[PDB]
Amino acid sequence: KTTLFCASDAKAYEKEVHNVWATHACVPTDPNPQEMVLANVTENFNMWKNDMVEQMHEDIISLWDESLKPCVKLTGGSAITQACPKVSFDPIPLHYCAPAGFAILKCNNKTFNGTGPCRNVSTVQCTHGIKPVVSTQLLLNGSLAEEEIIIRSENLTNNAKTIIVHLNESVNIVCTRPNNIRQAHCNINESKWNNTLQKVGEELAKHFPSKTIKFEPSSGGDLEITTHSFNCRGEFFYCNTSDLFNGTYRNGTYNHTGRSSNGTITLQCKIKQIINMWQEVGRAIYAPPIEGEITCNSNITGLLLLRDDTETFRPGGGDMRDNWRSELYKYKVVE
Numbered sequence: 001k002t003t004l005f006c007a008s009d010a011k012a013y014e015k016e017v018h019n020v021w022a023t024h025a026c027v028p029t030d031p032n033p034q035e036m037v038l039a040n041v042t043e044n045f046n047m048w049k050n051d052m053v054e055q056m057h058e059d060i061i062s063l064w065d066e067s068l069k070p071c072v073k074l075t076g077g078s079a080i081t082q083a084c085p086k087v088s089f090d091p092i093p094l095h096y097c098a099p100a101g102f103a104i105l106k107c108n109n110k111t112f113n114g115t116g117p118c119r120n121v122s123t124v125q126c127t128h129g130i131k132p133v134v135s136t137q138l139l140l141n142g143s144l145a146e147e148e149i150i151i152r153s154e155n156l157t158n159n160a161k162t163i164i165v166h167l168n169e170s171v172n173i174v175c176t177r178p179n180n181i182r183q184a185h186c187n188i189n190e191s192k193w194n195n196t197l198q199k200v201g202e203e204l205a206k207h208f209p210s211k212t213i214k215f216e217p218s219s220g221g222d223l224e225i226t227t228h229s230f231n232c233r234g235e236f237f238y239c240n241t242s243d244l245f246n247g248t249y250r251n252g253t254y255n256h257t258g259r260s261s262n263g264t265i266t267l268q269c270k271i272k273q274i275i276n277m278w279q280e281v282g283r284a285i286y287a288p289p290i291e292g293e294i295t296c297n298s299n300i301t302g303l304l305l306l307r308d309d310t311e312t313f314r315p316g317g318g319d320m321r322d323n324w325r326s327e328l329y330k331y332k333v334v335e
């Protein structure tokens with residue numbers, strides 16, 4: 001349809017790189033925006049074919065190119081060298097805004113699965129604040145669903161299509177490299193994981209009804225997708241999730257199978273210098289980790305799954321557009 005613009009609340013005195021990027025690329029935010037209901041209207045959306053996702057993907061690539069420069073970038077035959085200073089890195093929310101003569105329709109159905117017709121609709125100038133958080137397997141620091149866990153997929157019959165599970169209740173995950181400098185670990189409270197996967201198995205069962213529902217760890221691929229990978233405080237964490245995606249839900253009951261201990265699952269993590277890039281097909285080399293305690297305390301707010309009687313789901317990811325989709329699903333640009 002058109003070219004969106006971004007509004008953020010960043011300040012120009014922060015050294016933090018999302019703030020810096022935003023202060024030259026985004027406009028400040030309307031302190032009181034203005035919505036506009038239309039509960040008879042009913043319009044369709046398709047989260048899987050939504051141009052806003054492409055545009056924000058562009059922006060985040062831009063942000064990362066200006067903020068997290070690699071010492072080396074290998075793409076094609078070429079290798080680029082640049083200065084790769086350690087930086088202050090903590091994502092801030094970004095709002096996407098329709099320019100003059102355009103609006104953003106927001107679907108207000110709190111159970112809207114992301115495709116098809118939506119009953120109650122609003123008009124808005126901008127989306128909510130969206131933290132551009134790059135990760136795999138687990139979606140972090142998003143917006144919880146308001147009613148019940150929600151299964152999203154372009155086509156749930158096509159097992160090659162990523163599934164986005166939208167949780168309604170955060171599950172804490174705490175990842176730390178304490179004070180091998182490249183070793184770290186994550187802690188999740190097993191009870192709340194227990195619970196979350198049981199409710200998720202419930203919903204998945206609604207969609208696949210005769211079958212037991214198995215959670216298993218990612219089969220194969222680059223480390224970036226076979227582990228829960230993400231950037232914490234500038235450093236690239238790769239966390240093993242085999243004791244996380246490991247359990248069966250059979251008789252309306254979830255049994256967790258992965259090893260726990262003292263009531264918490266603990267992921268073993270490596271901090272890594274050589275990265276397979278999400279932005280494009282290529283490799284990126286970074287400097288060794290900063291010093292001291294590197295810790296991120298995050299909210300798991302959704303999952304990225306791939307489906308292989310029984311249905312089996314393993315963690316997926318790799319296409320960062322899906323992350324943006326998970327927040328942008330309820331919006332389209334009109335007029």
Ligand SMILES: CNCc1ccc2c(c1)N(C(=O)OCc1c(F)c(F)c(F)c(F)c1F)[C@H](CNC(=N)N)[C@H]2NC(=O)C(=O)Nc1ccc(Cl)c(F)c1
Nearest residue numbers: 134135136224229230231276277278279280281282318319
């Ligand atoms: C359904 N298929 C699953 C799947 C699995 C892995 C992957 C894809 C997709 N990819 C993908 O979609 O890239 C977008 C894309 C397009 F969308 C597109 F249309 C293109 F034409 C294109 F060129 C392109 F790059 C990545 C390719 N990039 C690479 N091989 N170097 C590959 N993901 C990653 O590597 C990855 O996430 N790393 C990583 C690094 C740091 C952190 Cl913190 C992190 F959290 C993750």
Ligand SMILES: *[C@@H]1O[C@H](CO)[C@@H](O)[C@H](O)[C@H]1NC(C)=O
Nearest residue numbers: 147148149168169199202203
């Ligand atoms: C969240 O969703 C699950 C199942 O979809 C439901 O059991 C639960 O009550 C919902 N709300 C919560 C957990 O606050």
Ligand SMILES: *[C@@H]1O[C@H](CO)[C@@H](O)[C@H](O)[C@H]1NC(C)=O
Nearest residue numbers: 113115116117151152153156
């Ligand atoms: C989403 O809803 C539409 C219509 O409401 C339906 O056709 C589609 O199969 C649903 N998809 C999922 C993944 O629930």
Ligand SMILES: *[C@@H]1O[C@H](CO)[C@@H](O)[C@H](O)[C@H]1NC(C)=O
Nearest residue numbers: 154155156157158159160161
């Ligand atoms: C979903 O994909 C399957 C292929 O796995 C195919 O039957 C069809 O094209 C799709 N079905 C629907 C309802 O869109």
Ligand SMILES: *[C@@H]1O[C@H](CO)[C@@H](O)[C@H](O)[C@H]1NC(C)=O
Nearest residue numbers: 223226227240241242243268
């Ligand atoms: C995760 O840990 C398990 C058990 O130690 C190991 O077998 C598996 O290969 C690990 N996965 C990755 C991607 O390192």
Ligand SMILES: *[C@@H]1O[C@H](CO)[C@@H](O)[C@H](O)[C@H]1NC(C)=O
Nearest residue numbers: 216217242243246257258259
């Ligand atoms: C679940 O965890 C156990 C030990 O924690 C491991 O041996 C097992 O292989 C895991 N399940 C799968 C399907 O990998």
Ligand SMILES: *[C@@H]1O[C@H](CO)[C@@H](O)[C@H](O)[C@H]1NC(C)=O
Nearest residue numbers: 140141230231296297298299
């Ligand atoms: C999630 O948000 C918290 C608080 O804003 C932050 O400390 C944490 O590092 C974030 N997680 C990631 C992976 O950015």
